[PDB]
Design a protein around this nucleic acid. Structure first.
Ligand SMILES: [Mg+2]
Lengths: 252, 456
DNA sequence: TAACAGCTCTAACAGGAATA
RNA sequence: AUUCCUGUUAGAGCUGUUAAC
């Protein structure tokens, strides 16, 4: 058959928080205030937020806050198809819910999210499957290390996680990659990544994708729709449920 | 909940060779049967002419000798068959040039190359062909060798030596095969010999192979754009490449500019319908005046609604119009499970939505492997371990992905400039992009159409 | 018209050769 | 430029959503 890299997102609607402002706001202003304050919440302007009200109160003073109510995005797929802001917001919410209770590093290259293996926690028990998948001839490989001929460059096994709107469905796209710890120096690991990925053929890539799904969802894709949640200790939280098995099809 | 629609697999497109012999493997079928144009005499012989600096003419002589003599594959022996020489393979002599058909590039070429002025380098190179213009009956293809000393003028911002030369020599109706040090240097000699020999036969006559079981009542249009960076803004050069098997045995593969200026790749109503007015007239002239029964318009980007209106107004209700956008870079990628040793088979397509499909123009091909038959061949194995599908978006779709997928897949195997098994893109888009680069290099090519052999 | 977002493209390089 | 198309680096265009002018 054909196994894709798409995990269904069966969640259809998420509850959000609206903060009404006394003055007009720009998405650029919101995103720069995000960087300045560094809240434990996700914010978009359409002002929608996921997380706790106290963090939003840190971001906006009480003078510029009029009210804080609830938003109901009834059709998540249609809304993210209509709005790129909604697409980005829901993708970030699913990523935060995915990498919450797990040691996995969360990185961003360009505007793609990556779940990266931590160098400190490389030898963990949950990473043994990834070690086996990237190993050679049945031994145990490595999922973090130093680039062979590089002065300071480091590498780890990562998975790019994307949100994809296809028809009326939402998909989590997983692409196994090699994350380079200095982002702007990733070009210096071109040959290293090429040699590492060279023989990751259909079998090895299937094993790697299975290992990454197991890492990201605690379970293999058999009869599973594990429910992840971002900000479980907050008034406005998003609870997504993702099928653990990637999308697949048998031919006719 | 994760089960998508059932996928399908388009069989590997058979290639027509001499006397209607079908083989999926181009080089194997070519060696076994001979070119499709060997039944008749399109080339009675392949006469070459030499244009190279007087120090580098031994290189052209040597590569021509390697074309004459057999060569054994070294790299990619999974796929590449033994090369038996030009005469043996193509059933046509490879006539070495006489002294009058062997012209030296002037020292002004070297001077302007060291000056790093590709604009004058192309002018001087075409001027070196002045003697060959009068002798266009004597030779078929001119062999131009570009020494590495001219590397400074091969490519830089706003210039392309290859496209400029091929643009200057296109109205002169003399085909050219350019040889760099890459062909001389690449370690596998069967690779270079096969590629150069097929190119020389295609542009010294034509049709090394055709497509087996190809409908003659269809036209295939591909619109591809290039970008020319203005000092103030940008300019877009959209070109249209048509393929069709006409009533004549000569497979038709042409390109023509869609055109003053464009600020985006999207044609207007009176631009899209103007280029399609040119397109169906071109089809009609090769079909005794018959209208196409189906039009396949391939685009790199999406069709605007004005473009759809122009497309549907350029053709009568009898003609079935297929507007398809080709998305090369997609997030989806696939694994073959039964996990197979080799990746998803080439030709496998998975419908995503009503208007969206994933076509695997890259993948494992069966029955093409030379060593250990029964083992699939993944052509891009050195590049990637798994094939990346393309995405097909339908802007006028009655239903059924099989027709468009088969069309696109068959359209990946008739690039005679491509030495490998196939292409990830249809030749409509490939040649429209090549001609877009040519037109962006030289604006004064808009009026005429040009066959593939003048720019491949 | 100015940001923002996403999607998808070209342009310009570098780079190695098909299950090891 | 015998080829292939993979990465890297940028950009542009399309759409939107706001703020407008
Ligand atoms: Mg060529």
């Amino acid at each position: 058959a054909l196994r894709t890299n798409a995990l269904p997102v069966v969640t259809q609607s998420i509850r959000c928080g609206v903060v009404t402002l006394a003055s007009p706001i720009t998405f650029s202003e919101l995103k720069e205030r995000i960087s300045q304050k560094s809240p434990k919440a996700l914010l978009t302007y359409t002002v929608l937020f996921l997380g706790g009200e106290p963090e939003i109160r840190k971001i906006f003073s009480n003078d510029e806050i009029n009210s804080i109510g609830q938003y109901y995005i009834d059709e998540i797929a249609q809304s993210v198809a209509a709005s790129t802001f909604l697409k980005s917001f829901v993708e970030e919410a699913i990523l935060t819910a995915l990498l919450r209770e797990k040691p996995i590093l969360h990185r961003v290259r360009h505007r793609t999210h990556y779940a990266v293996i931590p160098n400190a926690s490389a030898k963990d028990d949950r990473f043994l499957d990834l070690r086996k998948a990237v190993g050679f001839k049945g031994d145990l490989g490595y999922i973090t290390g130093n680039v062979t001929n590089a002065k300071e460059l480091s590498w780890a096994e990562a998975v790019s996680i994307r949100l994809e709107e296809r028809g009326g469905k939402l998909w989590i796209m997983l692409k196994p990659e090699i994350w380079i710890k200095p982002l702007d120096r990733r070009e210096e690991a071109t040959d290293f990544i090429r040699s590492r990925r060279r023989y990751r053929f259909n079998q090895c890539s299937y094993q790697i994708l299975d290992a990454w799904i197991k890492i990201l969802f605690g379970s293999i894709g058999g009869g599973g729709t594990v429910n992840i949640s971002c900000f479980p200790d907050a008034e406005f939280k998003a609870e997504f449920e993702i099928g653990t098995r990637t999308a697949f099809s048998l031919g006719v | 909940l994760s089960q998508l629609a059932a996928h399908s697999t388009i069989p590997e497109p058979l290639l027509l060779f001499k006397d209607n012999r079908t083989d999926t493997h181009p080089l194997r079928g070519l060696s076994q049967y001979g070119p499709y144009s060997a039944c008749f005499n399109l080339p009675g012989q392949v006469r070459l002419a030499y244009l190279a600096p007087t120090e580098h003419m031994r290189k052209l002589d040597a590569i021509v000798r390697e074309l004459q003599n057999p060569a054994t594959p070294k790299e990619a022996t999974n796929y590449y068959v033994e090369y038996g020489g030009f005469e043996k393979v193509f059933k046509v002599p490879l006539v070495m040039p006489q002294e009058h058909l062997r012209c030296l590039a002037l020292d002004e070429c070297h001077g302007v190359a060291a000056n790093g002025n590709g604009l004058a380098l192309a002018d001087k190179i075409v001027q070196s062909m002045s003697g060959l213009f009068r002798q266009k009956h004597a030779f078929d293809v001119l062999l131009v060798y570009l020494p590495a000393s001219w590397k400074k003028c091969f490519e830089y911002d706003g210039f392309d030596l290859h496209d400029r030369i091929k643009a200057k020599v296109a109205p002169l109706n003399l085909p050219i095969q350019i040889i760099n040090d890459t062909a001389l240097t690449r370690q596998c000699r069967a690779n270079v010999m096969w590629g150069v020999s097929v190119a020389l036969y295609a542009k010294a006559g034509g049709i090394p192979w055709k497509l087996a079981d190809w409908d003659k009542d269809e036209a295939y249009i591909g619109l591809s754009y290039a970008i020319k960076k203005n000092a103030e803004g940008q300019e877009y050069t959209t070109c249209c490449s048509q393929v069709f098997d006409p009533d004549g045995t000569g497979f038709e593969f042409v390109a023509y500019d869609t055109r003053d200026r464009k600020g985006n790749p999207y044609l207007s109503y009176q631009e899209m319908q103007s280029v399609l007015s040119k397109s169906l007239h071109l089809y009609q002239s090769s079909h005794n005046g018959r209208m196409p029964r189906k039009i396949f318009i391939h685009k790199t980007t999406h069709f605007t609604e004005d473009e759809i209106q122009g497309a549907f107004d350029s053709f009568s209700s009898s003609t079935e119009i297929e507007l398809v956008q080709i998305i090369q870079s997609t997030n989806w990628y696939g694994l073959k499970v039964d996990p197979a040793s080799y990746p998803v088979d080439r030709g496998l397509y998975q419908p995503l939505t009503e208007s969206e499909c994933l076509l695997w123009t890259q993948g494992s091909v069966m029955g093409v492997n030379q060593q250990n038959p029964g083992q699939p061949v993944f052509k891009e194995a050195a590049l990637t371990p798994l094939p990346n599908p393309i995405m097909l978006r339908r802007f006028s779709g009655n239903g059924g992905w099989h027709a468009t997928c088969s069309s696109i897949l068959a359209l990946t195997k008739v690039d005679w400039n491509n030495n490998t098994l196939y292409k990830k893109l249809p030749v409509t888009l490939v040649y429209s992009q090549v001609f877009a680069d040519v037109v962006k290099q030289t604006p004064e090519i808009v009026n005429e159409i040009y066959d593939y052999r003048f720019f491949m």
